[PDB]
Structure 1
């Protein structure tokens, strides 16, 4: 809904901006087991490609039911009576056709390549000159590094843009953490 707040640019001595500021965004939630609530929104307003950086500050709009129904147990409280809430913010009536996504990138792993190609419980008599893999050569990774266990710097991802709507998430339809489209504007 409307009830979204931003804090101003204060330095925080609890969160290093080194290796986990674009990895742990919804990882401490229980959205990977999906036993209770399932509504969570993932956004990225900041597309700035100058030199070795893409995205560095937090503005990620989640759902409406998660702050109100899922928080019957103490999980984000304690910081209730710190400050007084000021003049409320509006939901922006403009929005562009800009928003980025990451849904479906799992097609052909690179740590395990040579044996995914033909195993159907049979032999290999011709397995040396089947296709030329020496023709193509590409080197670019401008995407969000999002890490896991037993990883190097980053495994892979390629920009597979084009699916975009002005429609947010829906109930029951989740693939990783986000559906086709969404609402976040520039201001």
Structure 2
């Protein structure tokens, strides 16, 4: 169904490195996805460097002709349209391998894990008891900067039924990797 996509490139900037730009971008897309609603908008990073742990300088936006045509018709790129080079929406080539672009979270800050352990079992007691490409974001509710880690899954011959979160990440859905 999601046979349409659109690449967005981060135009080189003297003061802001690419990594910083992709952050802004991803945040922009997010705010617009919670506006669009639905779970049919995918996302991939074609320039993904699985070694250097860098997302790259390109954000591929997956969607159907209608869903995709509805997204970019919003003013979610006002702030950085001058920071972004992007063509028209085209149709994905085939045959194309499929993979998952999903968030990943590890367990750490035991001060945190233990605090929860205490809540669920009623500091001295508790105290006793990941290398991936990341985008850094800022929450709307509490003004905290958190690192959203992203991982591209092993290549598959097909795509299983699945949707996507308001960040365009895999909720179980697959995206064409090319």
Offset of residue 92 of structure 1: 0.8
Offset of residue 175 of structure 1: 7.2
**For the structure 1 residues 41 and 71, does the alpha-carbon distance in structure 2 shift closer, same or farther, using more than 3 Å as the test?**
same
Offset of residue 52 of structure 1: 6.2
Moved more, 71-80 or 1-10: 71-80
The count of corresponding residues between Structure 1 and Structure 2 is 177
Offset of residue 93 of structure 1: 1.0
Stretches of structure 1 lacking an aligned partner (at least 5 in a row): 132-139
The equivalent residue for 1:92 is 93
The question of whether the paired residues in 2 share the 8 Å contact of 1:165 and 1:182 is answered with no
Provide the TM-score with structure 2 as the length reference: 0.50
The equivalent residue for 2:126 is 127
How far apart, in 2, do the equivalents of 1:7 and 1:125 lie? 51
The question of whether the paired residues in 2 share the 8 Å contact of 1:23 and 1:147 is answered with no
The question of whether the paired residues in 2 share the 8 Å contact of 1:46 and 1:54 is answered with yes
The question of whether the paired residues in 1 share the 8 Å contact of 2:43 and 2:60 is answered with no
Offset of residue 23 of structure 1: 4.9
Offset of residue 177 of structure 1: 3.5
The equivalent residue for 2:176 is 185
Larger Rg: 1
What root-mean-square deviation, in Å, do the aligned CA atoms of Structure 1 and Structure 2 show? Answer: 6.5
Moved more, 73-82 or 166-175: 73-82
Provide the TM-score with structure 1 as the length reference: 0.48
Tell me the alpha carbon deviations over residues 121-161 of structure 1, each in whole angstroms, 9 at most, x when there is no partner.
5xx89556449xxxxxxxx5544444447999975667877
